[PDB]
From a paper:
PPARγ (peroxisome proliferator-activated receptor gamma) is a transcription factor of the nuclear receptor family that functions predominantly as a heterodimer with RXRα. The recruitment of coactivators by PPARγ is primarily determined by the interaction of coactivator LXXLL motifs with the receptor LBD. Helix 12 is key regulatory structural element in the activation function 2 interacting with coregulators.
The two other mutants of interest here are localized in the Ω loop of the PPARγ LBD; M280I is in the helix 2′ of the Ω loop and I290M is in the loop between helix 2′ and helix 3. The PPARγ M280I LBD crystallized in complex with GW1929 and PGC1α peptide as a homodimer and PPARγ I290M in complex with GW1929 as a monomer. The conformation and interactions of GW1929 in the PPARγ LBPs is similar in all complexes. For the I290M mutant, the surrounding loop connecting helix 2′ and helix 3 shows some flexibility as indicated by the poor density of some side chains residues and higher temperature factors.
Author numbering: 230 to 505
Write the structure that this text describes.
């Protein structure tokens, strides 16, 4: 391998994406792991590990109050539902801002830009959610709370099924030990998929993804020298991301049919509309 104009341009591309990733996503993997491993000495997340602690964390986590004369299981489900919805809407905006910085993206046909974001955002959301997870739980509300996996799993059906595929993915994904510099290129690779349904100009997207893939391959070689076949293993993880989306869509459809007063935010409806 040589540090020639080709590879140097790949490094400059990796740096450009890292810088735009830092600008677009306030809570990076580096900051989240610091919090999760207790490196933040003064301010620490409140832990939500059961019903009692969820209701004691209402103020810190922006949850509507739950009085003692309500169906506790139902109201908690609503709070978690609204909480995830708020976060997803914010996350779409961060990813959209990020995508505009991907070299070549803004030059694509505007309809193809929208199609790529439509099919990409949720896969990126689940990838970056893993940065905020360990086997115990997930950081929420800008890292001010930590909600446990078993608590999310105990919610009344169908709500208690929602997060488990995300945690199972995160544990395997986090064992790859990627850092923010790796992730910035990987999420660009997710976006620039030439196989999204309804793309008009496939060739310009593939040429960009080919370049991103080259950048990711070089990044992993330089940053993880003794991690054998890390590139291959990371690409296989895209298989799991797509299944997360598939199951999540199905669970949301159960909610649309068998639940009241939990309609999706309009932006999320537009993303899910005619998706696959
Ligand atoms: C666990 N979590 C971290 C963020 O988790 C996410 C988990 C999933 C998502 C994606 C997002 N999900 C929803 C969007 C709208 C309404 C509900 C959901 C749920 O996902 C949901 C549904 C039923 C029961 C529970 C959740 C999407 O599809 O756009 C985005 C974020 C929380 C929890 C409470 C408050 C804030 N943070
Ligand atoms: Cl290594």
């Amino acid at each position: 391998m040589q540090l020639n104009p080709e590879s140097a341009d790949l490094r400059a591309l990796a740096k450009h994406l890292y810088d735009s990733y830092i600008k677009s996503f306030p809570l990076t993997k580096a900051k989240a792991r610091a919090i999760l491993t207790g490196k933040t000495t003064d301010k620490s997340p409140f832990v939500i590990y059961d019903m009692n602690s969820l209701m004691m964390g209402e103020d810190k986590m922006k949850f509507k109050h739950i009085t003692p004369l309500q169906e506790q299981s139902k109201e908690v489900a609503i709070r978690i539902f609204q909480g995830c919805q708020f976060r997803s809407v914010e996350a779409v905006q961060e990813i959209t801002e990020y995508a505009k910085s991907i070299p070549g993206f803004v030059n694509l046909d505007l309809n193809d830009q929208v199609t790529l974001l439509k099919y990409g955002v949720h896969e990126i959301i689940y990838t970056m959610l893993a940065s905020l997870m360990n086997k115990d739980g997930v950081l929420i509300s800008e890292g001010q709370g930590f909600m446990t996996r078993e608590f999310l799993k105990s919610l009344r059906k169908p709500f208690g099924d929602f997060m488990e595929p995300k945690f199972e993915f995160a544990v395997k994904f986090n064992a790859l030990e990627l850092d923010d510099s790796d992730l910035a290129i990987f999420i660009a690779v997710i976006i620039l998929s030439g196989d999204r349904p309804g793309l008009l100009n496939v060739k310009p997207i593939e040429d960009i993804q080919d370049n991103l893939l080259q950048a990711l391959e070089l990044q992993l070689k330089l940053n993880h020298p003794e991690s054998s076949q890390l590139f291959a293993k990371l690409l296989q993880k895209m298989t799991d991301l797509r299944q997360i989306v598939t199951e999540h869509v199905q669970l949301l459809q159960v909610i649309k049919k068998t639940e009241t007063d939990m309609s999706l935010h309009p932006l999320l409806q537009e993303i899910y509309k005619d998706l696959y």
